[PDB]
Design an enzyme around this catalytic site. Structure first.
Site, mmCIF file in Angstrom:
data_model
loop_
_atom_site.group_PDB
_atom_site.id
_atom_site.type_symbol
_atom_site.label_atom_id
_atom_site.label_comp_id
_atom_site.label_asym_id
_atom_site.label_seq_id
_atom_site.Cartn_x
_atom_site.Cartn_y
_atom_site.Cartn_z
ATOM 1 N N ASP A 94 -8.243 -1.747 3.219
ATOM 2 C CA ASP A 94 -8.525 -1.232 1.883
ATOM 3 C C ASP A 94 -9.756 -1.905 1.287
ATOM 4 O O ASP A 94 -10.633 -1.241 0.715
ATOM 5 C CB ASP A 94 -7.306 -1.418 0.981
ATOM 6 C CG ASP A 94 -6.396 -0.197 0.969
ATOM 7 O OD1 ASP A 94 -6.437 0.589 1.937
ATOM 8 O OD2 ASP A 94 -5.646 -0.014 -0.014
ATOM 9 N N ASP A 111 0.826 -1.200 0.000
ATOM 10 C CA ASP A 111 0.000 0.000 0.000
ATOM 11 C C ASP A 111 0.862 1.252 0.000
ATOM 12 O O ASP A 111 1.660 1.475 0.914
ATOM 13 C CB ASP A 111 -0.928 -0.004 1.213
ATOM 14 C CG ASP A 111 -1.757 1.257 1.317
ATOM 15 O OD1 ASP A 111 -2.945 1.220 0.933
ATOM 16 O OD2 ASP A 111 -1.222 2.282 1.787
ATOM 17 N N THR A 162 -4.291 5.027 -3.952
ATOM 18 C CA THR A 162 -2.951 5.463 -3.605
ATOM 19 C C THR A 162 -1.907 4.559 -4.221
ATOM 20 O O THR A 162 -0.763 4.985 -4.407
ATOM 21 C CB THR A 162 -2.778 5.483 -2.098
ATOM 22 O OG1 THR A 162 -2.950 4.154 -1.594
ATOM 23 C CG2 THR A 162 -3.813 6.382 -1.490
ATOM 24 N N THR A 163 -2.276 3.324 -4.551
ATOM 25 C CA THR A 163 -1.427 2.543 -5.433
ATOM 26 C C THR A 163 -1.204 3.246 -6.769
ATOM 27 O O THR A 163 -0.323 2.834 -7.528
ATOM 28 C CB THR A 163 -2.021 1.141 -5.643
ATOM 29 O OG1 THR A 163 -3.415 1.232 -5.961
ATOM 30 C CG2 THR A 163 -1.831 0.287 -4.408
#
Lengths: 532, 154, 521
Positions: C386, C55, C88-89
């Site tokens: 997530d 992450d 956010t990846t």
């Protein structure tokens, strides 16, 4: 002959003061006008702060030289009085000081320059009041949007300027307030601003009411109330002390238990008196104890603790509730009255950016306005709240003084030539100071153009030409115009374009700049003292 | 600055300057309430309320509407509860008057101070045409008292 | 000395280039971490531990910086993570490449503000386009939800445990809905506690219809196993307490001392029978418990647990539906712990735990994670965070978007059409944004390890065809794949916030033009 420091006199110190003023000017010279580019400060430890509003920059920038401190304080005052022009006023002060010195740098006696400056300021404000534009005929919301979005460029939000101006004007019209019995004063800072990183300003929402940066005290206690029973209470909620010195002495042990019992039952009965009124919402700056929380849950009411005093005062003003520092009466017995209650359609805590904030919607007593910001980082959010605060300031000025000024530097565009013509009237030496005042004041278009990166001399010359034409053939209803732009790099009519600024901005700006010039110019020697 | 939340302007105001504190009575010499019994709790609470009530009630009975209180750093100042009563009774109120200013004030508005309840009487309450809190500095607020029937030379 | 005495300053194109360089570096240090083919990153924390996670948010959060714009990007990443969980990846990568193409117009002497306006128009059109290319989907249908979760997680370590992960997330999220908002109930992700216990295997981890308490029975006698317990939540301490008002006692007669000693005993008793009057079975408190009250409760055959964290108390209450109580005399049968299908205390090995399962309609729940070791468990729980986050986003919006870069290419040609219809100086920035978008599928390709240029060209040319917008890039094959059969789907709000924060990053950085140091305040 003073220990612990030397002294400097005459030309050296004059040049030093001008040098410092020019330094301070160049610090902010790049953050003004619809193409202004904002500043940012790596503080010392990473807590950066992006901002283009000059007064913020000056306050967060440490300063040691005296005259620079003078300019910084001037910027702070201007912010306390207008909100923008810290974009401008510092530049004006520095440029006037520069040219005034350039006169003095030759020989010219300073007090003559000061008198010329005083005359210049008075002439200028009079000519502005002969150059005023009145908004009363103009459509209210129209000119309000215009002034807003005019202020909105040179800022982070100028692009969304249309939406933001809509929101701002709605808020300010919703924060109407009846003043001294004859004034419709509108309180700035009354509207509440909360920052919340996350979604874009696109999704930043106006609240037809008031918003709290607080949370529900007890998780079991409910989340939403469709009823308006809102009571305020400064009086904190603890199993009370003896609160001054009252020692409790036991000679008959049989009563310690009952003593402890009422030590809480006092708060219990206070709470029950509050709730029997039927109030379902309570707020308290003071502490809230779990004792009260569980009672509230069993009653299912609404409780909030540690709220800031200003916020709850605004709550009372909106809902019509009464601030209550305690429970009392004209008679000694502590009672509570439903008449103390304020109302609002619905009160909800809501999760924005996994943080629950408390909303109050549509107080019936007095309409309130709060604004929530949405953005990427805390940097962009707090700089845009600074921007919005300036927005509300300028709109407040517009409403308070039904009078507007064409933006984009038309002010000094006219002023330079008008003062140029008026200079010859004096016949003394001071018209030289007048002319230098005008030429220096011509700085604003120069900075505008350079920050817009085109030929500045040519734009300035075209501006002066248009205004001089506006001072020939006095049939100027078809020969008086006003305007200047940057995005297309050529003049226009800002009146048609909607580029407007409030009058008080330029007026107070020129006045304070004149005072600053008078103060700093009269200098002719600093004497230093190394500390104790 | 003012200390009442709600009163900003007063017209035909009658001014009175008071020195003795408005709080729980605390003697010059060391004193303390002793609690040993049952009704002591509520008798206390009810009775400091009653005492403050008598204070404020007499203050109103004199007809005053604007209160002046000097520093009492040595001991209790004006209590919050008394402030609640006064705001309830709609009385202009001010804390923290410097002892050096008292002579100037009494010269100007023509009002001898009062240091005990009994001496506080409509005879001594000064009167001024207008008194209120101006607003300048954006939010830097200031006090003005214009017009006084007893024209002080200051 | 004039200004500040040891505060640096820097100006203009140098500043712009430096910030762009910083942003590009920030993007670069993560460009390998995206995609189902993703890498696996591990961290050295300042204070000794080991952290390993794909992450991006945690990766960046364990980064300190000196250049400021890097810090700004860090905060941007943390915000996007907080709001949506993943993306956010990809978010910072997109922002960095956005900026990188953006700078190319600076040496065009193109002033930033007009480019900014172009960006704003670009964001508006992108939002519109994505909304046009969504798919609404049912929320009740379980297996589509499971498919969504699998899609959103098949980028991190839990991929091989996809079935368990999806079942876990669906179960947890579905059963957390506080219906007290009328038809506007809200789920919350702070009652979905995550507990990491070492040992066992991933397969052993499961959703427990209740709460986990890392405490033990205070006394031997209380039964460790109960079918239908009754539960009482005592927020107050159950023992004798300081007289808060600095009380004192002055005894004179002999019996008085022993009598006052008996009095506190009697008070303890009073509390005890006040509790037992309600016929409870379970006593829970955040505070301590007197051993004497412990005696009395034992005499009543009542299980008691002491000194549990307040959040844990709240979760237990939400589990067995009862409400916390701070006054035993004010105890009400309405707060009796009804709705506990089974009370039990097991041994995980060298430690007791508390199991409260089989609630009637539990609204709170904690997940029991049982794996190999605390760091892998932490990675697992981050992935679970997530997954459950995107699941809740779906339960807020039933609209879905085809990922795998497909939406990106749709946006690309849409903006291309708008640009070629949108003559002006701002045109070039607009199509520049369009081209900058193309890099997410690109990065997918490199992380796969295929011919990036030819694959991307085939993709874009494929997507000039109006008949299909579902053509995306497979993670492993490295071949053009229509997304429908592949099934990698994502919640709309995810990608919305993604682009939205991205262009915000762009504007915020491009307005910057100068640096000032040493505030010392």
């Amino acid at each position: 002959l003073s220990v612990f420091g030397d002294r400097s006199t005459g030309e050296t110190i004059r040049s030093q003061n001008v040098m410092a003023a020019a330094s301070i000017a160049n610090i902010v010279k790049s953050s003004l006008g619809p193409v202004g580019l904002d500043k940012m400060l790596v503080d010392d430890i990473g807590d950066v702060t992006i901002t283009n509003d000059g007064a913020t920059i000056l306050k967060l920038l440490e300063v040691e030289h005296p005259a620079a401190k003078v300019l910084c304080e001037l910027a702070d005052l201007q912010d306390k009085e207008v909100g923008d022009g810290t974009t401008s006023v510092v530049i004006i002060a520095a440029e006037l000081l520069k040219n005034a010195d350039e006169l003095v740098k030759q020989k010219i006696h300073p007090t003559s320059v000061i008198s010329g400056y005083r005359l210049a300021c008075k002439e200028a404000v009079r000519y502005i009041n002969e150059n005023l534009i009145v908004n009363t005929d103009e459509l209210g919301r129209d000119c309000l949007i215009n002034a807003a979005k005019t202020s909105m460029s040179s800022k982070i939000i100028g692009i969304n300027g249309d939406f933001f101006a809509n929101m701002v004007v709605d808020a300010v019209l919703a924060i109407k307030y009846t003043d001294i019995r004859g004034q419709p004063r509108y309180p700035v800072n009354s509207v509440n601003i909360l920052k919340a990183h996350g979604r874009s300003q696109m999704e930043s929402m106006l609240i037809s009411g008031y918003a709290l940066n607080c949370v529900v005290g007890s998780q079991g206690m409910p989340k939403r109330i469709v009823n308006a029973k809102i009571a305020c209470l400064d009086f904190s909620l603890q199993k009370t002390k003896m609160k001054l010195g009252v020692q409790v002495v036991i000679t008959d042990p049989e009563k310690l238990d009952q003593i402890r019992q009422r030590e809480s039952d006092i708060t219990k009965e206070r709470i029950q008196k509050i709730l029997a009124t039927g109030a379902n919402v309570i707020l308290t700056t003071g502490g809230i104890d779990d004792m009260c929380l569980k009672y509230f849950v069993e009653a299912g009411a609404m409780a909030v603790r540690r709220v800031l005093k200003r916020d709850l005062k605004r709550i009372a003003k909106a809902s019509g509730a009464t601030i209550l520092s305690t429970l009392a009466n004209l008679e000694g017995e502590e009672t509570f009255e439903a008449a103390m209650l304020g109302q609002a359609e619905e009160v909800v805590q809501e999760r924005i950016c996994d943080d629950e904030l408390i909303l109050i919607k549509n107080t019936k007593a007095r309409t309130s306005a709060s604004i929530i910001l949405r953005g990427a980082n805390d940097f962009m959010c707090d700089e845009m709240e600074r921007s919005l605060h300036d927005a509300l300031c300028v709109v407040k000025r517009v409403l308070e003084s039904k009078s507007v000024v064409p933006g984009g530097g038309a002010v000094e565009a006219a002023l330079s030539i008008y003062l140029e013509n008026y200079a010859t009237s004096m016949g003394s030496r001071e018209q030289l100071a007048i002319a230098e005042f005008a030429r220096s004041l011509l700085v604003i278009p120069n900075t505008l153009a350079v920050n817009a990166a085109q030929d500045s001399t040519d734009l300035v010359a075209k501006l002066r030409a248009f205004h001089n034409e506006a001072q020939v053939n006095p049939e100027r209803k078809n020969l008086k115009w006003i305007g200047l732009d940057l995005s297309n790099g050529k003049p226009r009519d800002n009146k048609q374009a909607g580029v407007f600024e409030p009058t008080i901005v330029k007026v107070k700006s020129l006045k304070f700049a004149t005072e600053a010039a008078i103060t700093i110019l009269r200098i002719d020697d600093l004497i230093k003292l190394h500390p104790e | 600055k003012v200390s009442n939340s709600g009163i900003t302007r007063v017209e035909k105001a009658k001014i009175g300057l008071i020195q003795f504190c408005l709080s729980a009575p605390k003697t010059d010499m060391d004193n303390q309430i002793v609690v040993s019994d049952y009704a002591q709790m509520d008798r206390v609470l009810r009775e400091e309320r009653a005492y403050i009530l008598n204070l404020v009630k007499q203050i109103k009975k004199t007809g005053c509407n604007v209160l002046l209180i000097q520093k009492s750093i040595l001991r209790d100042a004006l209590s919050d509860l008394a402030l609640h009563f006064l705001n309830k009774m709609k009385i202009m109120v001010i804390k923290d008057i410097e002892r050096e200013d008292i002579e100037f004030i009494c010269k100007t508005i023509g009002t001898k101070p009062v240091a005990h309840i009994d001496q506080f009487t409509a005879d001594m309450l000064g009167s001024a045409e207008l008194a209120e809190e101006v607003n300048l500095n954006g939010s830097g607020k200031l006090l003005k008292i214009t017009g006084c029937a007893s024209p002080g030379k200051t | 000395l004039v200004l500040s005495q040891n505060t640096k300053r820097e100006s203009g194109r140098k500043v712009q280039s430096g910030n762009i360089n910083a942003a590009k570096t920030i993007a670069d240090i993560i460009r390998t971490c995206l995609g189902p083919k993703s890498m696996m990153k591990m961290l050295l924390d300042p204070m000794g531990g080991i952290v390993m996670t794909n992450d991006g948010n945690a990766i960046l959060r364990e980064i300190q910086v000196q250049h400021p714009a890097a810090k700004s990007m860090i905060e941007i990443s943390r915000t996007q993570d907080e709001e949506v969980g993943d993306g956010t990846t990809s978010v910072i990568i997109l922002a960095g490449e956005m900026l990188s193409v953006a700078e190319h117009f600076l040496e065009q002497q193109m002033h930033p503000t007009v480019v900014i306006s172009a960006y704003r128009k670009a964001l508006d059109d992108m939002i519109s386009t994505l909304k046009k290319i969504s798919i609404p989907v049912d929320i009740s249908d379980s297996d589509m939800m499971l498919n969504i979760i699998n899609s959103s997680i098949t980028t991190k370590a839990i991929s091989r445990w996809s079935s368990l992960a999806c079942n876990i997330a669906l179960d947890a999220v579905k059963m957390v809905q506080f219906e007290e908002n009328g038809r506007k109930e809200i789920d919350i992700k702070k009652y979905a506690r995550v507990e990491k216990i070492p040992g066992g295997i991933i397969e052993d981890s499961c959703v427990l219809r209740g709460v986990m308490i890392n405490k033990d029975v205070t006394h031997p006698r209380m039964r460790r196993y109960i079918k239908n317990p009754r539960i009482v939540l005592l927020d107050s301490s159950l023992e004798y307490k300081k007289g808060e008002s600095q009380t004192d006692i002055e005894i004179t007669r002999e019996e008085d001392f022993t009598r006052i000693l008996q009095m506190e005993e009697e008070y303890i008793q009073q509390l005890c029978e006040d509790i037992i009057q309600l016929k409870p079975d379970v006593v829970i408190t955040e505070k301590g418990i007197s051993d004497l009250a412990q005696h009395y409760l034992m005499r009543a055959n009542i299980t008691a647990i002491r000194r549990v964290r307040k959040t844990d108390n709240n979760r237990i209450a939400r589990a067995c539906g009862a409400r916390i109580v701070s006054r035993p005399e004010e105890l009400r049968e309405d707060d009796v712990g009804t709705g506990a299908g089974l009370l039990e205390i097991k041994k995980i090995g060298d430690e007791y735990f508390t199991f409260i399962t089989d609630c009637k309609d539990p609204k709170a729940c904690t997940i029991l994670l049982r794996g190999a070791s605390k760091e892998i468990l932490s990675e697992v729980e981050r992935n679970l965070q997530d997954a459950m986050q995107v699941c809740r986003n779906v339960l807020l919006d039933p609209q879905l978007v085809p990922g795998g870069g497909a939406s990106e290419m749709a946006v690309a040609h849409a903006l291309t059409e708008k640009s070629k219809a949108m003559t002006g100086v701002e045109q070039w920035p607009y199509r520049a944004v369009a081209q900058a978008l193309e890099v997410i599928p690109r990065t997918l390709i490199q992380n796969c390890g295929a011919s990036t240029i030819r694959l991307l060209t085939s993709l874009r040319a494929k997507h000039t065809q109006e008949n299909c917008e579902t053509w995306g890039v497979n993670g492993e094959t490295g071949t053009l794949v229509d997304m429908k059969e592949l099934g990698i789907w994502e919640p709309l709000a995810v990608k919305l916030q993604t682009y939205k924060t991205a262009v915000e990053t762009a504007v915020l950085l491009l307005r910057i033009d100068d640096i000032v140091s040493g505030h010392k305040k």
